[PDB]
């Protein structure tokens, strides 16, 4: 679907979509939010996949 | 007053604020004591029902 959206036109001009530097703050996460992240399913799945 | 109060105090034994870390208020042990009356100036006194 993404490829179709891109090929909506026959010839696609060179897009000036340079990746601006969107480096986000490594904000200090609250202990509650950190525990929520640790208890999240994605974190457990990634930890299992690390092996 | 002898068991459940201690468990409730232990559940909230530590309370701290997000700003200015390394600051905390830790509860150690809670007591109820005997019935008293605050009539006297800054002094307690046994009072009957």
């Amino acid at each position: 679907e993404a490829a179709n959206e891109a090929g909506d036109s026959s010839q696609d001009e060179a897009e000036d979509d340079v990746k601006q530097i969107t480096v986000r703050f490594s904000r200090p996460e609250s202990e509650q939010a950190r525990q929520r992240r640790v208890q999240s399913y994605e974190f457990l799945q990634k930890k299992h996949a690390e092996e | 007053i002898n068991v459940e109060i201690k468990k409730i105090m232990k559940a909230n034994e530590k309370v701290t604020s997000d700003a200015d870390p390394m600051w905390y208020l830790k509860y150690l042990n809670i007591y109820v004591g005997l019935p008293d009356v605050e009539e006297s100036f800054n002094v307690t006194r046994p009072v009957s029902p």
Partner: protein, 303 residues
């Protein structure tokens, strides 16, 4: 030894502050396979000493800004972990409240960081003219954007109503004189209309020659002034097709302004006190507000 690879990559980044591609690293160190270089770059990014950029030429690895230091008292960690979004904001600036909320730090720590950064000339605090609530912090090297601060009309966070009024009056007088000259020429209707027309560049150069104020007024400023005049119902603008000329502002288009008289004189409703009455809704035959004992009509008939 991957430590030597990381050290060499850091040295190469030091040599090129703008960043280095994988081809440069391969040319500088050809005896190392691509997998080892990839692992080294992954470790460098994990430990937080490199940043990745996606340019039209590919990927660039740049050393993180650590040499540029304004707040060395304490730890450079918070220094850079504030300067990061300070730079990200850049021209548009950012209020102290937003910096605090993005840093998740108390007010005292961020205040200290900002003061120490201002001490060594890394950030400048300018008053937000749009909403004068707090001072936004920007990079000292970047030019302040006109929208968030500054402007030809705003002077010290104060709108100059007198300045815009004088500009409008002078532009209207110039356009009226031009239209009068065009009408008096009476050479040909088309020539008359073309002469009564005034291009934005012409009126801009005229205002510049007048020199009412010291601040430099760009062409778009005079264009906005003429648009405001049009909104006043006193002038008319037309977009003609012209490829290139002394203006060269818009591609193939030129805006010509001319003083035009109103459509109709004041109507009859406004000539009666009833049409300009602010308590017209409460009008009633028998009551406190009655046309018989009206003060507006009384003063209007007495005058």
């Amino acid at each position: 030894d991957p430590v030597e690879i990381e050290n060499r990559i850091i040295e190469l980044c030091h040599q090129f502050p703008h960043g280095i591609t994988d081809q440069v690293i391969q040319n500088e160190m050809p005896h190392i396979e691509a997998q080892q270089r990839a692992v080294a770059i992954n470790r460098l990014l994990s430990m937080g000493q490199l940043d990745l950029l996606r340019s039209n030429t590919g990927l660039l690895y740049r050393i993180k800004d650590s040499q540029n230091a304004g707040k060395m008292k304490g730890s450079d960690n918070q220094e850079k972990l504030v300067y990061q979004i300070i730079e990200d904001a850049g021209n548009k600036g950012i209020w102290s409240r937003d910096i605090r909320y993005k840093s998740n730090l108390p007010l005292t720590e961020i205040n200290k960081i900002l003061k120490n950064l201002e001490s060594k000339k890394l950030i400048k605090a300018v008053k937000s003219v749009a909403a004068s609530k707090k001072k936004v912090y920007m990079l000292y090297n970047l030019q302040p954007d006109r929208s968030v601060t500054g402007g030809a009309w705003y002077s010290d966070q104060d709108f100059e109503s007198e300045f815009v009024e004088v500009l409008n009056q002078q532009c209207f007088k110039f356009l009226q004189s031009k239209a009068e000259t065009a009408r008096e020429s009476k050479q040909n209707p088309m020539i008359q209309r073309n002469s009564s027309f005034a291009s934005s560049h012409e009126v801009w150069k005229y205002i510049c020659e007048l020199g009412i104020s010291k601040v430099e007024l760009s062409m778009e400023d005079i264009e906005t002034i003429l648009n405001t005049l049009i909104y006043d119902g006193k002038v008319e603008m037309t977009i003609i097709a012209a490829k290139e000329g002394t203006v060269g502002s818009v591609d193939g288009h030129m805006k010509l302004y001319r003083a035009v008289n109103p459509i109709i004189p004041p109507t009859g409703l406004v000539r009666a006190p009833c049409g300009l009455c602010p308590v017209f809704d409460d009008c009633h035959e028998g009551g406190e507000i009655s046309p018989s004992n009206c003060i507006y009509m009384t003063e209007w008939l007495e005058f």
